[PDB]
Design a protein around this ligand. Structure first.
Ligand SMILES: *[C@@H]1O[C@H](CO)[C@@H](O[C@@H]2O[C@H](CO)[C@@H](O)[C@H](O)[C@H]2NC(C)=O)[C@H](O)[C@H]1NC(C)=O
Ligand SMILES: CCC(CC)O[C@@H]1C=C(C(=O)O)C[C@H](N)[C@H]1NC(C)=O
Ligand SMILES: CCC(CC)O[C@@H]1C=C(C(=O)O)C[C@H](N)[C@H]1NC(C)=O
Ligand SMILES: CCC(CC)O[C@@H]1C=C(C(=O)O)C[C@H](N)[C@H]1NC(C)=O
Ligand SMILES: CCC(CC)O[C@@H]1C=C(C(=O)O)C[C@H](N)[C@H]1NC(C)=O
Ligand SMILES: CC(=O)N[C@@H]1[C@@H](O)[C@H](O)[C@@H](CO)O[C@H]1O
Ligand SMILES: *[C@@H]1O[C@H](CO)[C@@H](O)[C@H](O)[C@H]1NC(C)=O
Ligand SMILES: *[C@@H]1O[C@H](CO)[C@@H](O)[C@H](O)[C@H]1NC(C)=O
Ligand SMILES: *[C@@H]1O[C@H](CO)[C@@H](O)[C@H](O)[C@H]1NC(C)=O
Ligand SMILES: *[C@@H]1O[C@H](CO)[C@@H](O)[C@H](O)[C@H]1NC(C)=O
Ligand SMILES: *[C@@H]1O[C@H](CO)[C@@H](O)[C@H](O)[C@H]1NC(C)=O
Ligand SMILES: *[C@@H]1O[C@H](CO)[C@@H](O)[C@H](O)[C@H]1NC(C)=O
Ligand SMILES: *[C@@H]1O[C@H](CO)[C@@H](O)[C@H](O)[C@H]1NC(C)=O
Ligand SMILES: *[C@@H]1O[C@H](CO)[C@@H](O)[C@H](O)[C@H]1NC(C)=O
Ligand SMILES: *[C@@H]1O[C@H](CO)[C@@H](O)[C@H](O)[C@H]1NC(C)=O
Ligand SMILES: *[C@@H]1O[C@H](CO)[C@@H](O)[C@H](O)[C@H]1NC(C)=O
Ligand SMILES: *[C@@H]1O[C@H](CO)[C@@H](O)[C@H](O)[C@H]1NC(C)=O
Ligand SMILES: [Ca+2]
Ligand SMILES: [Ca+2]
Ligand SMILES: [Ca+2]
Ligand SMILES: [Ca+2]
Ligand SMILES: [Ca+2]
Ligand SMILES: [Ca+2]
Ligand SMILES: [Ca+2]
Ligand SMILES: [Ca+2]
Lengths: 387, 387, 387, 387
């Protein structure tokens, strides 16, 4: 049965550890893909980790040069949550160096972008069969979420970008039904920049929190209904969510320029005027992770907050993070439950290896007791192949 | 359908070998997790082996230092009984350095504790979805069975301990329904010590046989009904069950102080005034294993027994042991069948390696002919990684 | 339910990338079969890659000498599309050094040829059970498609060749029902040569495009109805499809003798007088791959064409290619969708290794936007075993 | 639904190759169990290979000394037919150094013998649950078929031996229902010797062809009905079936003394007065394999035969062989189809290695065209671990 997606997001006071794969530790000997850009998505029956492989295994010579983002060898694959991504346990999804995926309650939708930078093509699959494609409309790296799309009542929604990563680009919202693009809208967003959106359903509407790689240290957001009527803004909290970013201070409802260039994929959950912000602990590099509840941070610009929970230590590597939800159809609850994942990036450019790869952790929102700690990647670098 | 749990334990005259995984032997070459604290639990359709990984594989450098009990890398995972615990065949359950699991007849309950020693949190999952959490109440290594919880009529039961491992601690019993704690009781047990309980259902009541790490070389027990009304005692038999222990003498109905400090997880099955006792063969180390039937050993203090069956030879490594049961809903019998498993610990601290890991064997009680033998681990240490 | 096979081929404007397995890159470390002659075939539920193993893994000494085509160690196996062919994820099909397979909508049919060159036997299995055999009738390497057979209304069809690969041979067409040969016909085709046919259903009739290894650098074809009444010809286009071949010039409706000796397995899709041709980029070796639409190339001899889409760059290795289809029963479309795969051959005879193996890519035809690129094998040769 | 087992054995004129696993070649790199005593058995849905592992993988140090027959590390496991026996694709069955298994149409029965030579215990499991045990009655290596048991009308039948392998021993036939022994009879067979029976159903009765290890170079047989009323004899053919054996000459309907000591597990299929005999090609060692049709060989003593089909070349290693059948419930045929497997033994005692392991091939009987060839193991010895 189709996910209804019409209930509200469950309010939560804390985050309980849900999974840890130890991928890089295990890949030191085991046959584990070199990956990056992992994300989690759930069906009414199961949660899966999706990821972009480099078409190579850890500790093998073909992991050489895997700091490179886009190549014909990259593929979107998936495995059950918490298991290491191996050629022996992973399902093939598509050929992709940028991707998204989500389940509408009936079948998996996957979106995999491959091809040259000047003419990339997103291939849409529904239940593993090609159902549609869309080609680059600005000829400058067509790219998408690197996290799950959001589903409401049999329609799935995603955001794609085409154009400069360091200046004004073009941003489109899509509605997809059974793998067919049935509507798209280009956002009219002058002076905004959207990359790598983390999108979730909440009361039949979609909220996306994204990355301004151009000139924003706070995160831009876009919200829309099923007809793709939309609103845009930036998270106002002085608790800045991007990385890099400046010191916390008075915020802005527009892009905060200071340290605004570059960024990292991230997420936040809106609750009225309040916001749960996940972010790195460092203002300069992808180190640490923490969750912060700011009760008026969606719309208010002060840097006060009410709850902070430690997730990864400042002296440990982190990386991308993203939202995922668990629908009532899966959980039996009366609301849509918020969860998130964190990518723990190891290797280049911060460490002296020939490769770059990630492992992952994830957490789900609860209203019972939780504890801050650090659950880092834990691998000992360099590896044999690096010697 | 819910497991009734209302029939009695099958009377058994001996133990038939059920499984052996040869994990450490296989892990010399194959990709096998470093694990400890394995245990078995059954649904109405299958038996699974659960275990706490160290987030590392045997014969890899990340196995270095795995004598260490608690870290953020440890995860509870499971695989089909008798198969090696591998990243290619194991299902992820929970992030955990202490755990329990059982099946109510409908879905799996797992309990996984992680976090800092001074503020750990147990995460409960029902069918893999987080359903409850509970925080440490003594701030000193919140910890649980390391074997299966027990289920009666749709409720599951477990025991957790928090506080000193070398003096009076705090012991709680829980009733859990669909992964939610619906009642807990703190045991009023001054001068008793309970760790790592092996609990089983019998005529709608739960009996747990546990480990006194403080000052008892005989095993403490707690029995309770579905309302958590409980009774406590120590096994009276002069056939002492813990390790270390003194040589068999006249026993006691309270804790036997002689060699009472420290211990090993173990189990026993009560039959009226009699008891089936599983224990190491050595009185000083985790070597050997044997099953002993003492017809008056639950309540009586002499050291006379009438059946002894060899399981692991005295010159071979053993370790933890625990009960599991097979319910009528699985077996088609008219009673609950008692079974047990033994963990065979290899590596530190007794052997010259950088790592510690275990393999397992298991047996089921029958009333047909059986035989004693020795079914040891059989790996040849040290391994390549140790040289 | 049986595949009807009565609708027409979907007209297509381009080819969207569907799968890429990265087998050779991954097999540098992981346990991946040495294979050649892969192909894809679909059921109403799933698509699988079939392949002929060499009974050996990459980077192991038993890969030595695997340039050799026929041995008793070769087996037909299959795995899900896009996954690497590993002993841990592959289903065994048959013992075979030449093969075909297809699904009639109810069960898989496989055809596996093994035995001596002077008396080989094809073993037919339906749902994994042996249902028929046919022995060599010319005693000179009985051999078959190395791609999927074609099914219409509960009957499946294939072509086999027996006799010289450098001169006139004998060619038979078979109708197979539930794994039993129910009719066969020997083609009367003087001066034709048919090897390794790629056959697809289209409006209840079968069209095969094959390899002339004797004296044609264009491809021979045969089409037939369910009663095995047949027509024969060569693709007339001056855009020659075989490898090796001459530079494009005026074509022939018979075999083009210029550079006509030898060849490579290939395919083409007929649309009226037009043809989609897949071919290598190099005229002299198995390098590069491209798809070309020639609006009058089935029957016209000019070398003019409308569309070209790049698949593999001319400086990268390619190899065999073949057609596969996805029926309406799988896709929900009102027509039969054409797709194709390409084998990317690495090792001998072109590279300094002891072994020969391939990886694969595949594409499906669509009417939405697509893009040419190069999706090559990507392995770095030689491997450890070659030193 | 229960297998009826009431139709006759299909008459067959030749043997078509069914499977080949290449286990030893693949295990040179991949994670493949050291095994011996493989056998095949089918359910109404699938065919599986069963085997006795040595609790160790190929090319690892724990494969040392695996010439040894009985140890506590040996386990019965199974995998789909034609797949390599790996810890990643194998199902655990039982702890066993002698075994049998068969499917009654409803569930798998496995029988696994372990324990000391003077008191071994067979453990019976039905659907993986222990259902019965039987202990040694002569205290001298209780042992069984090492091939599939035979099922008729919901009852399964096997033969076990206890006592000397070089003189008169004790042989029992068992009827088993839902894993419970419901009847047994001790065979009154002075001067007969029965080891390692290959038994098959045929028209509601069971026929077993076994190994005389005491003083016969032809094979003993026993036939019985569902009530365990039985008859005994030896295959009369002068085409001697055992290994070692003398050169063919006039046979005996009793044990042929010449070269009678020792032997190898094998099989034969009775058709009236005639017999299909599978045997090694060498009269002195386990080399080569061939199928021979002797139209009066069940009952007549001449060495005349009418068909011979080569299976393994005389210069190649062979080993155990055994029957298995495919019932009408699986095949859709109106008779019971005879098939057989051959174990190809590599390593000790004939080759310079520290280990012994086998691969397997299998064939099914057909009435269509077939061919002889050699399908040998193909591994290159010694392995890395041997050097
Ligand atoms: C296991 O861990 C120990 C550290 O706890 C490693 O020993 C160290 O090796 C480094 C060289 O990288 C030396 O500089 C240190 O002095 C060593 N420490 C100690 C306490 O000896 C050891 O190499 C590890 N073994 C592995 C990874 O195989
Ligand atoms: C091309 C712009 C884009 C978003 C800013 O770059 C991303 C930077 C990422 C990063 O900052 O780590 C890595 C991503 N793999 C990459 N995406 C693509 C499609 O290459
Ligand atoms: C902390 C007390 C506890 C019980 C005595 O210690 C156990 C001793 C065990 C042991 O005796 O081998 C190892 C266990 N993994 C450990 N449990 C935890 C949670 O670390
Ligand atoms: C025997 C003739 C045949 C077709 C021309 O050769 C093929 C050449 C092939 C090739 O050109 O690469 C390799 C094939 N495996 C081989 N087929 C067999 C059965 O050996
Ligand atoms: C103990 C007698 C028996 C049959 C003659 O020996 C067999 C000889 C076999 C052989 O000849 O290769 C190997 C078997 N694994 C062994 N069976 C057992 C249970 O050890
Ligand atoms: C341009 C093209 O591809 N189509 C040509 C057409 O224009 C031309 O008349 C014909 C003969 O030259 O060949 C074809
Ligand atoms: C959500 O949708 C379902 C299906 O229509 C409906 O029954 C339910 O009332 C809705 N819940 C809301 C609106 O919160
Ligand atoms: C990685 O690539 C660099 C540059 O091509 C090369 O010099 C180096 O040898 C490579 N390292 C490995 C381990 O392949
Ligand atoms: C959801 O979709 C269904 C089916 O298309 C449609 O009929 C209905 O209007 C929608 N329901 C809600 C709650 O919007
Ligand atoms: C156990 O409970 C079941 C379900 O109520 C019942 O059918 C059965 O008779 C009970 N057995 C007892 C009370 O011993
Ligand atoms: C078992 O559970 C059912 C449902 O809650 C209840 O009605 C019944 O009384 C229970 N039996 C007991 C408590 O023994
Ligand atoms: C294909 O066959 C089906 C089933 O007979 C039929 O319903 C359909 O009309 C056919 N399609 C054609 C002839 O195009
Ligand atoms: C491959 O085979 C050749 C010829 O027999 C042999 O000389 C060579 O050593 C082999 N190479 C390997 C790595 O086995
Ligand atoms: C398809 O097959 C069925 C069963 O033989 C037959 O009745 C029907 O006429 C066939 N349709 C055709 C030939 O298109
Ligand atoms: C075999 O037994 C079945 C009943 O179990 C009967 O219907 C059939 O006629 C018998 N004959 C065969 C198929 O051998
Ligand atoms: C196997 O054991 C033999 C005899 O003890 C010994 O000579 C040899 O070194 C061992 N080999 C390995 C690799 O364990
Ligand atoms: C199988 O056994 C019993 C009678 O002995 C009964 O279920 C059935 O009639 C039998 N079927 C036969 C004789 O094939
Ligand atoms: Ca930014
Ligand atoms: Ca605030
Ligand atoms: Ca103690
Ligand atoms: Ca006593
Ligand atoms: Ca040619
Ligand atoms: Ca043209
Ligand atoms: Ca003999
Ligand atoms: Ca004769």
């Amino acid at each position: 049965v189709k996910l209804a997606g019409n209930s509200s997001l469950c309010p939560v006071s804390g985050w309980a550890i849900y999974s840890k794969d130890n991928s890089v530790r295990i890949g030191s000997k085991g046959d584990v893909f070199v990956i990056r850009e992992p994300f989690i998505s759930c069906s009414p029956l199961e949660c899966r980790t999706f990821f972009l492989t480099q078409g190579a295994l850890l500790n093998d010579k073909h992991s050489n040069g895997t700091i490179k983002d886009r190549s014909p060898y990259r593929t979107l694959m998936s495995c059950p949550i918490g298991e290491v991504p191996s050629p022996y346990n992973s399902r093939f999804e598509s050929v992709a160096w940028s991707a998204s995926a989500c389940h509408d309650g009936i079948n998996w939708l996957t979106i995999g972008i491959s091809g040259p930078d000047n003419g990339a093509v997103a291939v849409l699959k529904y239940n593993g069969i090609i159902t549609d494609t869309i080609k680059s409309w600005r000829n400058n790296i067509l790219r998408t979420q690197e996290s799950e799309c959001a589903c409401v009542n049999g329609s799935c929604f995603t955001v794609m970008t085409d154009g400069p990563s360091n200046g004004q680009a073009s941003y489109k919202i899509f509605r997809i039904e059974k793998g067919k693009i049935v509507k798209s809208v280009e956002m009219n967003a002058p002076n905004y920049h959207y990359e790598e959106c983390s999108c979730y359903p909440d009361s039949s509407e979609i909220t996306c929190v994204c990355r301004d790689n151009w000139h924003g240290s706070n995160r831009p957001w876009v919200s829309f209904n099923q007809n793709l009527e939309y609103q845009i803004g930036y998270i106002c909290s002085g608790i800045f969510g991007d990385n890099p970013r400046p010191n916390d201070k008075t915020g802005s409802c527009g892009p905060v320029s200071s340290n605004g260039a570059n960024g990292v994929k991230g997420f936040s959950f809106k609750y009225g005027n309040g916001v749960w912000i996940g972010r790195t602990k460092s203002i300069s590099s992808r180190n640490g992770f923490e969750m912060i509840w700011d009760p008026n941070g969606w719309t208010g610009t002060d840097n006060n907050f009410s709850i902070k929970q430690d997730i990864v230590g400042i002296n440990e590597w982190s990386g991308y993070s993203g939202s995922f939800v668990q629908h009532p159809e899966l959980t039996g609850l009366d609301c849509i439950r918020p969860c998130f994942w964190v990518e723990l990036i190891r290797g280049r450019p911060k460490e002296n290896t020939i490769w770059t790869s990630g492992s992952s952790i994830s957490f789900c929102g609860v209203n019972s007791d939780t504890v801050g700690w650090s659950w880092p990647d834990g691998a000992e670098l360099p590896f044999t192949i690096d010697k």
